[PDB]
Amino acid sequence: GRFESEDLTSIVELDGLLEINRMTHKLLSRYLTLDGFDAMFREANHNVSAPYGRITLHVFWELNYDFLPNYCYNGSTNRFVRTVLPFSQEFQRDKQPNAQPQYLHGSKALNLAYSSIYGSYRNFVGPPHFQVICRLLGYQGIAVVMEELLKVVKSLLQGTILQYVKTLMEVMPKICRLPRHEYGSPGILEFFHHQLKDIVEYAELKTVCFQNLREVGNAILFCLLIEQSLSLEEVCDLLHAAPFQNILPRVHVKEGERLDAKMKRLESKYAPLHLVPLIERLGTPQQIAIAREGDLLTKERLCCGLSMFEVILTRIRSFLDDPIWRGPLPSNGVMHVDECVEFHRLWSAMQFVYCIPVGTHEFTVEQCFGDGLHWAGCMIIVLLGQQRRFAVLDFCYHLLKVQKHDGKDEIIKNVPLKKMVERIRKFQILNDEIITILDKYLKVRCFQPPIHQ
């Protein structure tokens, strides 16, 4: 109940309290006769008679409500920190149940000490939280959480995000071609601002679409991080199970002694530790069958060469079916160049609008959304197969290239040029890395020659 009455960051405290309870049960079992700690834990979690326990349901609830729309990712530190201004407070969590200190860590002093110890994890989510979640959710919790996350992503992409994209497409310029380098960086910036002026004045872009984009990016980032944690846990388990599965390391070999003989001698020395063969030699038929099944389960894990992000990416791509994402066929029959009927142009417009240096009394994009917005946009672009087109066709990239070529700095419409191009440089550095990562996870048309007349 205490775990259910707090946010997701209380998972470490819950794990510590569960460890304390397990230690108490072990101590008491010396004289008394109680059920196994697993049975009591499952009865309390209601997982005995249900596929999913209370812990996994609460984790999913928190992920849906408080985690995704409030935490902004930071790739440099691989940590999550809460948004400077919350855009969601309707969580309405339960009331903390009071109880005697004994039911808690054991005493007032012990409770205070443990609260102080676990108070450092309250304001961030990181590898420790992910590994604790994996340990507590086994495989069922991860599977159900990822299924619900996929459902939420499908609902968001085909719902509010789709309507906002459709609305923004109409206001976008009918045709927009990158200006030549002769005009110069200031004229090009002025032209881009005039062409995209209507997008800038739009207010809901930075409060709903951006928010939705942040929600879809945090979900995918959580999926990626959870998988890595699971893989690490599996590798540790595999390392522990080597002695009982006849798995040995590469033993040192010296001149005069052959590797094969040394390995054979080492295996012979560890022969008693082997379980399966030993059980077969001295075991009942039922025991042997159970042992074989257990060994098989122990040796087969997802870390043995099974990937899981590719399926999620394919499902997200399949969720994109509206023609607005790709638009009509090109007039020239090869690709769109001038027309802005593709989502990549809209993403470029978003980058241009939120790359403008904001004042001192307002938050920036990173402060509120962090890297979730960029991750979501890059994922969408990659799944739409327009990363190369986006890189070639982009207002910010062309403006930065022209600024570098000419090297000018002017205050064009209350917008510094050098700071804007530096921000564009940083953002494209981030976008390139994100796109490269996405492409690394996921991995013709012939024309006719002219005919004489």
């Binding site: 349901l57 849906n64 159900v144």
Partner: peptide, 8 residues
């Protein structure tokens, strides 16, 4: 999602 209904 529907599991949200169930937990509610």
């Amino acid at each position: 999602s529907v599991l949200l209904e169930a937990i509610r």
